Amino acid sequence: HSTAIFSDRYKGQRVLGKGSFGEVILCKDKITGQECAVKVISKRQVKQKTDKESLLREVQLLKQLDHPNIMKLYEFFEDKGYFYLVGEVYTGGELFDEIISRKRFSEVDAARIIRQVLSGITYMHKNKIVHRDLKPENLLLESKSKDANIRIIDFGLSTHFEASKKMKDKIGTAYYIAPEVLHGTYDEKCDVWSTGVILYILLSGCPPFNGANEYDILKKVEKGKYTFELPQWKKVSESAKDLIRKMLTYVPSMRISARDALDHEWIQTYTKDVPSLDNAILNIRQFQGTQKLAQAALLYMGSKLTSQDETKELTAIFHKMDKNGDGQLDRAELIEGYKELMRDASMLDASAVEHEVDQVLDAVDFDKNGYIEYSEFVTVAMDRKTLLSRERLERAFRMFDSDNSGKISSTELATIFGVSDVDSETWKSVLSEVDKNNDGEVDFDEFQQMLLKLCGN
Numbered sequence: 303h304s305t306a307i308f309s310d311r312y313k314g315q316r317v318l319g320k321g322s323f324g325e326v327i328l329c330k331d332k333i334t335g336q337e338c339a340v341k342v343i344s345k346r347q348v349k350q351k352t353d354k355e356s357l358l359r360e361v362q363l364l365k366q367l368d369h370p371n372i373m374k375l376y377e378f379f380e381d382k383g384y385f386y387l388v389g390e391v392y393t394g395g396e397l398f399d400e401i402i403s404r405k406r407f408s409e410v411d412a413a414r415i416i417r418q419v420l421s422g423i424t425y426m427h428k429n430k431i432v433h434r435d436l437k438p439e440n441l442l443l444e445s446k447s448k449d450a451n452i453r454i455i456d457f458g459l460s461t462h463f464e465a466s467k468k469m470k471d472k473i474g475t476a477y478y479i480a481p482e483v484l485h486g487t488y489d490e491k492c493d494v495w496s497t498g499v500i501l502y503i504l505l506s507g508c509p510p511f512n513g514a515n516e517y518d519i520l521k522k523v524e525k526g527k528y529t530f531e532l533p534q535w536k537k538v539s540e541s542a543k544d545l546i547r548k549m550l551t552y553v554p555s556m557r558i559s560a561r562d563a564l565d566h567e568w569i570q571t572y573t574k575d576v577p578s579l580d581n582a583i584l585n586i587r588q589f590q591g592t593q594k595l596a597q598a599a600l601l602y603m604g605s606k607l608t609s610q611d612e613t614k615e616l617t618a619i620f621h622k623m624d625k626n627g628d629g630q631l632d633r634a635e636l637i638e639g640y641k642e643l644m645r646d647a648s649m650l651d652a653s654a655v656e657h658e659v660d661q662v663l664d665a666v667d668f669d670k671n672g673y674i675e676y677s678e679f680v681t682v683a684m685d686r687k688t689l690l691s692r693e694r695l696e697r698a699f700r701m702f703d704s705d706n707s708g709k710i711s712s713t714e715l716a717t718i719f720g721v722s723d724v725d726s727e728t729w730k731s732v733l734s735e736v737d738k739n740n741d742g743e744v745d746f747d748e749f750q751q752m753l754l755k756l757c758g759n
């Protein structure tokens with residue numbers, strides 16, 4: 303009786319993105335053609351909180367649950383290096399990204415969104431599963447269809463896997479975390495808090511607990527005080543604010559349950575004219591742009607560091623293989639070395655690696671059937687990746703620069719690096735090196751230069 307192997311059943315199609323605990327890859331069943339989203343968790347980056355037996359039983363429960371606002375889990379695999387969580391793929395994108403693409407957004411739209419989130423949470427709580435890490439990135443629209451349901455992803459994972467301590471993994475997280483989670487004694491009510499934070503953001507476009515860096519955010523959360531004194535709260539019903547107050551009640555025993563929040567006047571009224579919350583949409587668009595650029599900045603720097611690491615490793619690997627030291631290896635060798643290297647969730651299969659080597663060889667018009675100058679292969683394969691990383695950062699810079707100025711101001715940098723939790727005198731120091739003219743703004747290239755200096759380059 304033999305243990306099921308992930309790659310015997312599924313082939314990788316493409317990377318969907320980064321989520322909590324790992325990369326998510328669009329895969330396909332090699333027999334049935336079923337497409338799925340597979341979260342690949344590396345045992346080297348992510349430690350388990352529970353034992354094997356506890357995880358296996360949770361997975362077995364999760365597979366049997368079914369609700370229109372919860373991600374479906376189909377299968378689970380484990381091998382020496384990874385866990386694989388095989389789920390249904392959702393293609394409508396993140397909630398907040400759909401919201402900012404509309405010209406209109408009212409309390410009716412927010413109530414219908416929150417009803418869905420509370421409905422999913424209610425179901426999971428009845429089944430004794432807690433999310434703990436509910437945030438906007440965990441709310442995916444099922445498809446691009448006008449009336450697509452919201453699907454909450456990652457329920458139950460935080461019970462089994464330890465959260466990363468790396469800022470590139472923590473972007474966004476502090477705004478939403480319940481104060482009792484910080485102090486250690488928590489239960490399912492933490493999910494109602496996080497929902498309350500999200501609803502506050504839907505209706506005003508600003509986090510209720512904010513600050514200039516991650517720890518300042520956490521300090522505000524822990525104090526637990528917030529207000530509705532912003533001008534844009536004047537546009538909002540008293541019932542919406544009453545529900546928020548109940549969800550952001552500090553002592554969790556006193557906080558409203560998810561199921562009771564579904565019976566709240568605000569949900570009952572607004573989910574059956576109502577003005578558009580235009581200032582809120584404006585603020586959400588800004589919030590989202592900033593969060594996305596900070597994230598892109600951190601991933602860019604991570605990509606540069608991974609390249610410094612991998613380029614020299616790949617070179618030493620091939621140097622060792624080149625037994626007579628003439629610098630030439632054949633394609634089967636390049637594949638074996640690239641394999642020794644990956645020993646990138648999308649490259650955890652021999653066939654995917656073969657395919658990638660062929661893409662690199664074709665890029666440079668190296669003939670695949672003879673012997674190849676390996677140092678040139680390494681350069682090409684790494685320059686491709688450096689080019690890709692540069693292009694992802696740029697897209698995010700252009701998105702943030704919504705007036706098409708070509709520039710990010712000093713004040714905007716302060717906001718971005720604060721979200722990125724890059725030390726203020728540190729980024730200011732690097733800005734003084736780059737901005738020799740006291741223009742107090744940077745273009746894309748200059749911004750990229752700052753990021754390189756903030757990762758030792």
Ligand SMILES: COc1cc2ncnc(Nc3cccc(O)c3)c2cc1OC
Pocket residue numbers: 318319320321326339340341373387388389390391392393395442455456457459
């Ligand atoms: C299109 O973008 C994404 C689409 C996704 N669709 C479904 N699940 C995801 N994540 C997931 C999949 C399996 C288990 C799990 O806990 C979480 C997704 C992630 C995406 O990007 C990160």
